[PDB]
Design an enzyme around this catalytic site. Structure first.
Site, PDB file in Angstrom:
ATOM      1  N   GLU A 234       0.802  -1.223   0.000  1.00  0.00           N
ATOM      2  CA  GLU A 234       0.000   0.000   0.000  1.00  0.00           C
ATOM      3  C   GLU A 234       0.837   1.277   0.000  1.00  0.00           C
ATOM      4  O   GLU A 234       0.550   2.206  -0.756  1.00  0.00           O
ATOM      5  CB  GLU A 234      -0.947   0.019   1.198  1.00  0.00           C
ATOM      6  CG  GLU A 234      -1.866   1.223   1.218  1.00  0.00           C
ATOM      7  CD  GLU A 234      -2.725   1.282   2.464  1.00  0.00           C
ATOM      8  OE1 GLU A 234      -2.490   0.462   3.374  1.00  0.00           O
ATOM      9  OE2 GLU A 234      -3.640   2.141   2.541  1.00  0.00           O
ATOM     10  N   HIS A 268      -5.101  -3.290  -1.868  1.00  0.00           N
ATOM     11  CA  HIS A 268      -4.282  -2.166  -2.354  1.00  0.00           C
ATOM     12  C   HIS A 268      -3.340  -2.577  -3.482  1.00  0.00           C
ATOM     13  O   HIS A 268      -3.580  -2.235  -4.642  1.00  0.00           O
ATOM     14  CB  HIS A 268      -3.527  -1.435  -1.229  1.00  0.00           C
ATOM     15  CG  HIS A 268      -4.392  -1.089  -0.057  1.00  0.00           C
ATOM     16  ND1 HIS A 268      -5.528  -0.315  -0.172  1.00  0.00           N
ATOM     17  CD2 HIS A 268      -4.293  -1.423   1.252  1.00  0.00           C
ATOM     18  CE1 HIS A 268      -6.096  -0.193   1.015  1.00  0.00           C
ATOM     19  NE2 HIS A 268      -5.365  -0.853   1.899  1.00  0.00           N
ATOM     20  N   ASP A 319     -13.062   0.323   2.670  1.00  0.00           N
ATOM     21  CA  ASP A 319     -11.894   0.349   3.560  1.00  0.00           C
ATOM     22  C   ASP A 319     -12.068   1.196   4.834  1.00  0.00           C
ATOM     23  O   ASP A 319     -12.655   0.710   5.804  1.00  0.00           O
ATOM     24  CB  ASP A 319     -10.645   0.758   2.775  1.00  0.00           C
ATOM     25  CG  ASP A 319      -9.360   0.462   3.514  1.00  0.00           C
ATOM     26  OD1 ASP A 319      -9.394  -0.177   4.598  1.00  0.00           O
ATOM     27  OD2 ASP A 319      -8.299   0.851   2.996  1.00  0.00           O
TER      28      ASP A 319
HETATM   29  N1  LIG Z   1      -3.581   0.522   5.727  1.00  0.00           N
HETATM   30  C1  LIG Z   1      -4.795   0.956   6.006  1.00  0.00           C
HETATM   31  N2  LIG Z   1      -5.391   1.760   5.172  1.00  0.00           N
HETATM   32  N3  LIG Z   1      -5.505   0.571   7.188  1.00  0.00           N
HETATM   33  C2  LIG Z   1      -4.849  -0.276   8.131  1.00  0.00           C
HETATM   34  C3  LIG Z   1      -4.015   0.648   8.953  1.00  0.00           C
HETATM   35  C4  LIG Z   1      -2.995   0.040   9.844  1.00  0.00           C
HETATM   36  C5  LIG Z   1      -1.834  -0.643   9.207  1.00  0.00           C
HETATM   37  O1  LIG Z   1      -1.768  -0.775   7.953  1.00  0.00           O
HETATM   38  O2  LIG Z   1      -0.923  -1.083   9.948  1.00  0.00           O
HETATM   39  C6  LIG Z   1      -5.808  -0.954   9.029  1.00  0.00           C
HETATM   40  O3  LIG Z   1      -6.960  -0.473   9.175  1.00  0.00           O
HETATM   41  O4  LIG Z   1      -5.444  -1.997   9.639  1.00  0.00           O
HETATM   42 ZN   LIG Z   2      -7.650  -1.956   5.071  1.00  0.00          ZN
END
Ligand SMILES: N=C(N)N[C@@H](CCC(=O)O)C(=O)O
Ligand SMILES: [Zn+2]
Ligand SMILES: N=C(N)N[C@@H](CCC(=O)O)C(=O)O
Ligand SMILES: [Zn+2]
Lengths: 451, 451
Positions: A234, A268, A319
């Protein structure tokens, strides 16, 4: 029951005067174009298969929009993540369920008929397991049933704070399980999910959050009937960190160490080089593109044109839920390609020059595949999940076939979705969900408690 | 008349319990925070100044979304333009007016309270002037009055097919005037526009479509009270062609040859190098950013962060009208910067870390300036143009002040705009415009005639 559509998008393309017979269990039983509407409910506009939402973290809807405050000249995904951790730390089981129910109602109103809930909030506020460790997973299922949305629950394996099996942070305490506890949770969820008509999938949070040994252990555990989801590539930082750890890029590493195939949804996958894109397309895995969140988080633009050209499969997910809009995701999937290339009409097929139709076809198929559900198509034997657009809207009323999808997706919006059916049950009628008043009251109370 | 808002965004910031007195002519006469609502209409949610739409070509709404068909592996703005020319060639005066009226109703419902109509469809189907050459301009004004939207009409000088004064194409025949005929049209429009309470501006289509001598002639003609609009630097091709013609980039050329100042609105200005951005900001001209159209046409991403950092002024326009959404324009203005920089929270001020508020403040001010109208602010002496958001929406009801703008602009959408007032008159109430039924019927008939 029977419904009748003057226009409907069937697997072979647009058809007219289609009478659908729906079983008592909500399965499409008979589909007859050029039919009479005798005894069937006449629908109020063009009918499409419902759109699966292949990636969700429900609780994040509660903070949606609130992270748009500069706290640094170079705010990024990583300062956002701290804010998200602060909210997760205070969420009670009851609040989580209220947020999920409200979110799922909003999803249905936008035309999302099923959702893959990428669920990593497992434990209590102290990071200790509830008496039944499935406490919060079961509430997600209850919320989905209350809204009436299809659900693939993806309990998430999350064990570490970074590459090399770094120890989990205190902010991650609610997420943490070892492989053994995770496999026990996964197996324990089968019965209640089955009872609710819901589905299950395997899920690793990311290559940062689990180890290669854990991936091997889980994949060897015999749950071969389940989809497999993972966040991957991502952010550029994950790419750099992965290379420092292994000498490989994230997608490169996954494909070199794991037998990725059609069961997989790579969420992603933003930073995919040409070799990685080729490998994805060859494997038949689904790219889980979350366009509004990726833009909101400043992730970057996926090489969707190159991917699609090689037979890549994709779907869309909301998301972080800053947006709940099939229109916005598909529109800005295309528009991102246009802004990058400085050209128009980017995502089409050799047999399909219509951009809207290309996008809808792609995301229906990829979404159904990623969820592991019999959806994404109005065909006999598949579940009766559908949306009805506004037949009184002048743009849609004046359009036929694929032009109608272009009017909606590129010139229209969410309020053109009027009626929504999931599993043969009307869950949205004339833009309204029967549970909306009670849910909104519970939800505004929860927002007050949190903020 | 008097209205009362529990929350309103005033020039000094958010205020509570604000009673507004509005003159018989629709001008804000008294604004009193922390007041009683005695005898005033209590409003149903948070009140904001209405958003000016600083760039529109009304007729294009009729084709919105229909150009999303690949006809070439490298479709671009230039193949789109051919399709647009095909539609312009068949539009009757009556059709143009019907489209404009419907469009303006839709604009109002989105929260756009005034529009700058960049109007270049002048002549009959044969390219000959109507008996009164102002025929179509007068219909734009009539349509705006019927919808109830504020209007700055910008009749457009268009004379040539390209740099160096190339002869106009047959496809451009309806647009063409020499400087003398244009100045006559401009002067003739003053009285009818004034009578309708509408405004006027000078306008050159682009540096491709007019000559330097024409620009000089028009600017020397004495219409010093008028805004000046021009499309500039939208596509890389115009940049390359301008350099081949003059040895200068488009913005560079304009600033070296013309005294650009606060009267000017530079539409798109997309391909602005650092020196050009600096010159824009120093001049006080308004960048007319049309984010959804620029994305749809694959123009590129404006250096908004650099521009804003140097005191740049901007506003938003819906342009080709694929989108009619204040939310979408401001949201994707910010998101485009995020995707480019791969960072969050890009457009803020030194005194304002809130992204939504920064964007709304900026576009209100730039929009009012570009239109040359006393709008963009709820201050005594300015016109009573405002929107009322949904006070029953749980996201908005739970938020205060600038957080509310973040919820709307980044987590919400158009249907959160419930009531809209222009010149002291309610033109949208609970999402409905009184003229919508008649307009939609006329409009769907016109769509059938065209398509
Ligand atoms: N990457 C995104 N958009 N979200 C992740 C954030 C936390 C991470 O990736 O460690 C999540 O919700 O787990
Ligand atoms: Zn996510
Ligand atoms: N550039 C945009 N988006 N629109 C122009 C197209 C024609 C041209 O620029 O020559 C216009 O409507 O005049
Ligand atoms: Zn334009």
């Amino acid at each position: 029951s029977a419904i009748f559509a003057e226009r409907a998008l069937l697997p072979e393309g647009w058809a007219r005067n289609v009478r659908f017979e729906i079983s008592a269990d909500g399965v499409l039983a008979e589909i007859r174009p050029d039919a009479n509407a005798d005894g069937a409910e006449r629908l109020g506009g063009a009918v499409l298969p419902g759109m699966p939402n292949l990636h969700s973290h429900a609780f994040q809807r509660a903070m949606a929009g609130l992270a748009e405050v500069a706290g640094n000249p170079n705010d990024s995904f990583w300062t956002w993540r701290e804010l998200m951790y602060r909210m997760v730390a205070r969420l009670s089981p009851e609040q989580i369920e209220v947020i999920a129910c409200q979110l799922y109602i909003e999803m249905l109103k936008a035309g999302y008929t099923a959702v893959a809930e990428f669920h990593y909030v497992h434990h209590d506020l102290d990071g200790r397991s509830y008496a039944d460790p499935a406490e919060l997973s079961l509430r997600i299922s209850r919320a989905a049933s209350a809204a009436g949305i299809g659900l693939t629950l993806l309990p998430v394996l999350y064990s570490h704070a970074g590459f090399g099996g770094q120890p989990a942070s205190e902010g991650q305490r609610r997420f943490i399980n070892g492989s053994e506890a995770y496999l026990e949770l996964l197996q324990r969820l089968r019965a209640p999910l089955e009872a609710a008509g819901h589905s299950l999938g395997l899920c690793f949070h990311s290559l940062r959050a689990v180890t290669p040994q854990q991936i091997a252990t889980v994949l060897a555990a015999g749950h071969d009937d389940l989809p497999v989801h993972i966040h991957i590539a991502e952010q550029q930082k994950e790419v750099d960190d992965c290379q420092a750890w292994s000498g490989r890029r994230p997608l490169q590493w996954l494909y070199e160490n794991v037998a990725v195939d059609q069961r997989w949804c790579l969420v992603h996958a933003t930073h995919a080089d040409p070799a990685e894109v080729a490998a994805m397309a060859r494997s038949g895995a689904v790219a889980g593109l979350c366009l509004s969140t990726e833009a909101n988080l400043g992730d970057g633009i996926f090489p969707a044109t190159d991917f699609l050209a090689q037979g890549g499969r994709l779907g869309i997910g909301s998301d972080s839920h800053v947006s709940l809009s099939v229109v916005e995701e598909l529109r800005w999937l295309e528009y991102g390609q246009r802004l990058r290339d400085r050209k128009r009409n980017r995502l089409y097929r050799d047999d399909q020059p219509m951009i809207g139709r290309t996008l809808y076809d792609a995301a229906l198929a990829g979404g159904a595949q990623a969820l592991g559900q019999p959806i994404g198509s109005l065909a006999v034997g598949r579940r009766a999940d559908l949306l009805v657009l506004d037949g009184n809207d002048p743009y849609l009323a004046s359009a036929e076939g694929d032009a109608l999808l272009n009017r909606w997706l590129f010139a229209g919006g969410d309020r053109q979705v009027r009626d929504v059916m999931v599993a043969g049950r009307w869950v949205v009628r004339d833009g309204r969900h029967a549970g909306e008043e009670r849910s909104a009251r519970a939800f505004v109370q929860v927002l007050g408690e949190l903020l």
